[PDB]
GROMACS .gro file of N, CA, C and O in nm:
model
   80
    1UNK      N    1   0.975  -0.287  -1.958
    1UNK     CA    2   0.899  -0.163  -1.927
    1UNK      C    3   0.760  -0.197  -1.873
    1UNK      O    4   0.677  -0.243  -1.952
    2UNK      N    5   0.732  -0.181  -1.761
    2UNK     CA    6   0.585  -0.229  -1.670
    2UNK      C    7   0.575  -0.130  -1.562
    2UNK      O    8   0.637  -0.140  -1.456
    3UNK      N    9   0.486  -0.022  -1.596
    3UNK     CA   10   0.472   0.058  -1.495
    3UNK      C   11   0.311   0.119  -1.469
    3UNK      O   12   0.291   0.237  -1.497
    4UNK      N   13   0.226   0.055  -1.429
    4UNK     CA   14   0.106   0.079  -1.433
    4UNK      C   15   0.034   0.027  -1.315
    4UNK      O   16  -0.088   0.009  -1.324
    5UNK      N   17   0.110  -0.004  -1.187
    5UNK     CA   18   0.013  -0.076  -1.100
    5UNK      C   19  -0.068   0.085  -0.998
    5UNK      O   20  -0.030   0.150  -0.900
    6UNK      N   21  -0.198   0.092  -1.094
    6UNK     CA   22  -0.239   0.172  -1.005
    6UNK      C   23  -0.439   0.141  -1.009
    6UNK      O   24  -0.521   0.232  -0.997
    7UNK      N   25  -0.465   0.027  -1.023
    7UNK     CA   26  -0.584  -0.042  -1.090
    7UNK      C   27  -0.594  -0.170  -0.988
    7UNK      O   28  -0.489  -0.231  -0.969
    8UNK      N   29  -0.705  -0.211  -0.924
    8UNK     CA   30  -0.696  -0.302  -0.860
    8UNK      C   31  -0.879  -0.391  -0.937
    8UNK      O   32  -0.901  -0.511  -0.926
    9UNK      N   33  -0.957  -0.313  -0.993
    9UNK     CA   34  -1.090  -0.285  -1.034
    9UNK      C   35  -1.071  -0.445  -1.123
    9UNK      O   36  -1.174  -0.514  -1.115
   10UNK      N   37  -0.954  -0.510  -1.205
   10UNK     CA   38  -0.935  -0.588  -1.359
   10UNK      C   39  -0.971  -0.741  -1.295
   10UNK      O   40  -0.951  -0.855  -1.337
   11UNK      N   41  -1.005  -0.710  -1.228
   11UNK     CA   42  -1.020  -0.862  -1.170
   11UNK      C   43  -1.139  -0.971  -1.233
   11UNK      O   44  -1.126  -1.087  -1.272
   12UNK      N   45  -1.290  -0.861  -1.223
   12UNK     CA   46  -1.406  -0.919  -1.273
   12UNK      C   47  -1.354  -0.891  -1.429
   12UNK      O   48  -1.401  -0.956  -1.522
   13UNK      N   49  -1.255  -0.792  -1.449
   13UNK     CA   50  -1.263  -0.761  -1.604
   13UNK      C   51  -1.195  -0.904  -1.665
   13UNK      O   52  -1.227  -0.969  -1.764
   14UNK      N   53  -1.126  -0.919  -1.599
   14UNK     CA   54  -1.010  -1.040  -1.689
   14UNK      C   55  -1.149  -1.147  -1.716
   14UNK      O   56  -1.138  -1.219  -1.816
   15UNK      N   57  -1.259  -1.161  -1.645
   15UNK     CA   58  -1.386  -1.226  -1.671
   15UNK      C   59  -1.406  -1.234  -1.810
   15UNK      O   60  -1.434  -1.338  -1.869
   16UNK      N   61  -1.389  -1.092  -1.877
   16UNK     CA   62  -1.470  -1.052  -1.972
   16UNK      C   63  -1.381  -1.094  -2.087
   16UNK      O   64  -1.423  -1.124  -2.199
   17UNK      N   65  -1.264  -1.092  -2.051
   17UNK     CA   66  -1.210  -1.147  -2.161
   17UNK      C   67  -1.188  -1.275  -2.199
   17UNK      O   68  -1.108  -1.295  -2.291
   18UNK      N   69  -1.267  -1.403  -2.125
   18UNK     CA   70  -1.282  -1.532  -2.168
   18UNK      C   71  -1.395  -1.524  -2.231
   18UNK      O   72  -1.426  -1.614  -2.309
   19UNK      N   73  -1.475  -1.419  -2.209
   19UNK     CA   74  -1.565  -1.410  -2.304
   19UNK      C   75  -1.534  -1.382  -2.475
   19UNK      O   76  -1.613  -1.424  -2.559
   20UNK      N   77  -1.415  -1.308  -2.512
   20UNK     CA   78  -1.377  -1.287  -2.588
   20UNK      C   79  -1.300  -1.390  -2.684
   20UNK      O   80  -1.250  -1.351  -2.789
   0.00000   0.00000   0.00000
């Protein structure tokens, strides 16, 4: 079940989560 490609913005976000 994968149905969500409507976001292109996660790019700098995935950043944020090596911060984590």
């Amino acid at each position: 079940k994968a149905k969500l490609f409507k976001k292109i913005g996660i790019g700098k976000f995935l950043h944020s989560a090596k911060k984590f």
